[PDB]
Amino acid sequence: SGEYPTVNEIPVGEVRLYQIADGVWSHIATQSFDGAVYPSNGLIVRDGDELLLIDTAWGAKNTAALLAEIEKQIGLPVTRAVSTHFHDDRVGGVDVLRAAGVATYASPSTRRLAEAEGNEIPTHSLEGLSSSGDAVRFGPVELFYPGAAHSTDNLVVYVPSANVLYGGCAVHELSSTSAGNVADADLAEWPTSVERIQKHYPEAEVVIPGHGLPGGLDLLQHTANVVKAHKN
Numbered sequence: 001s002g003e004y005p006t007v008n009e010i011p012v013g014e015v016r017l018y019q020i021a022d023g024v025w026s027h028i029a030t031q032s033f034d035g036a037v038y039p040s041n042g043l044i045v046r047d048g049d050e051l052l053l054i055d056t057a058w059g060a061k062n063t064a065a066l067l068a069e070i071e072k073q074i075g076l077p078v079t080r081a082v083s084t085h086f087h088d089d090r091v092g093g094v095d096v097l098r099a100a101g102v103a104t105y106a107s108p109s110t111r112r113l114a115e116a117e118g119n120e121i122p123t124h125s126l127e128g129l130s131s132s133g134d135a136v137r138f139g140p141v142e143l144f145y146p147g148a149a150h151s152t153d154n155l156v157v158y159v160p161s162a163n164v165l166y167g168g169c170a171v172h173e174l175s176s177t178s179a180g181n182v183a184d185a186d187l188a189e190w191p192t193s194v195e196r197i198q199k200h201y202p203e204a205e206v207v208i209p210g211h212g213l214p215g216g217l218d219l220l221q222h223t224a225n226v227v228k229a230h231k232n
């Protein structure tokens with residue numbers, strides 16, 4: 001009823017949308033992994049009379065439910081999707097998207113990692129993102145590679161029309177007490193990658209983490225703090 005949704009509002013298999021700004025929504029879904037339930041976020045950005053999707057809803061059935069929720073709430077076709085790293089909360093559901101007419105994209109690094117790990121593989125490679133600090137335009141967003149953080153391939157997304165920074169899993173919510181699932185992370189480089197984000201997007205008004213509640217720019221410093229303390 002208006003607050004940002006959590007798993008207590010989200011049974012696994014259902015998807016909620018949250019209006020972030022004009023033409024910008026997040027999507028929220030829940031999934032089970034290793035016997036615990038987690039929320040995760042993605043982004044939807046209006047692209048004229050089409051929509052750009054950032055990240056799947058963490059699984060095939062969740063992603064089908066996402067498409068249905070978008071049709072119900074927005075009613076514009078999703079034509080393209082970008083996955084911001086290779087984990088299942090970002091690419092699980094790419095096969096559903098591809099069978100629903102959505103062109104799927106990721107960096108070559110993400111595509112290689114997804115293939116090697118047995119995850120679903122976006123169709124199209126996003127060049128121009130292989131060096132930290134690189135940025136490219138993709139419809140109504142800018143894609144930015146900050147360096148290794150949560151994963152070596154993690155991308156962040158900026159919506160310039162709304163000053164919305166979608167950090168993905170390189171950015172944690174303010175309530176977080178540890179750095180999440182760090183299996184594929186680089187804890188030593190992560191603060192430097194966050195500093196790159198802070199320098200590149202000083203005018204961000206909303207910052208959206210890969211999991212949990214949006215806030216402001218403080219999410220970036222908080223992330224650096226929790227990662228430095230985790231490394232210790």
Ligand SMILES: C[C@@H](OCc1ccc(CN)cc1)c1cccc2c(-c3ccc(CS(C)(=O)=O)c(Cl)c3)c(C(=O)O)[nH]c12
Pocket residue numbers: 033038087088089150169172173175176177178179180181182183184210211
């Ligand atoms: C999809 C998968 O990604 C990793 C993965 C690890 C190993 C393997 C098998 N090699 C596959 C995938 C995944 C699976 C399960 C959980 C996560 C989390 C996660 C996010 C937040 C918190 C709360 S907090 C900041 O700690 O307060 C916690 Cl506990 C965990 C994150 C995240 O941090 O982005 N990702 C998760």
Ligand SMILES: [Zn+2]
Pocket residue numbers: 085087089150151169
């Ligand atoms: Zn991840």
Ligand SMILES: [Zn+2]
Pocket residue numbers: 087089169210211
């Ligand atoms: Zn994640």
